[PDB]
Design a protein around this ligand. Structure first.
Ligand SMILES: *C(=O)/C=C\c1ccc(O)cc1
Length: 125
């Protein structure tokens, strides 16, 4: 497995070297979102929670079509503020209920080492 703990401070440095496959060995959900909310990466872990297909939701809008349940001031609002601000590192509990059993999860959002890329790590709680 890809040994890298959830919530690690230097996670974007460690993760900035993993291809898709490399990214599928993680013990938690990982999503790469561009500046507009377009899915750049989607690993198998999150798929296992949301039931979506990693290869299927690539290139689609996450807040608009993939995960509308995150279209709120509590998810989206924080994201845009971060996008616009140029930075963001925030941890929070949340519930994904769209097209699925309500699953009490925890979300960690942080800007990547790259320019306009943002990470959205998720785990069961
Ligand atoms: C709220 O988040 C509902 C559904 C959902 C859809 C896609 C992904 O990746 C997570 C959760």
């Amino acid at each position: 497995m890809e040994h890298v703990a959830f919530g690690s401070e230097d996670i974007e440095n460690t993760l900035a070297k993993m291809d898709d496959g490399q990214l599928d060995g993680l013990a938690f959900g990982a999503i790469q979102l561009d500046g507009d909310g377009n899915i750049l990466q989607y690993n198998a872990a999150e798929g296992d929670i949301t039931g979506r297909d990693p290869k299927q939701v690539i290139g689609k809008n996450f807040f608009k079509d993939v995960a509308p349940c995150t279209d709120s001031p509590e998810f989206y609002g924080k994201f845009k503020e971060g996008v616009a601000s140029g930075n963001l590192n925030t941890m929070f509990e949340y519930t994904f209920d769209y097209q699925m059993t309500p699953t009490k999860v925890k979300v960690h959002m942080k800007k990547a080492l790259s320019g306009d890329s943002y990470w959205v790590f998720v785990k069961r709680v």
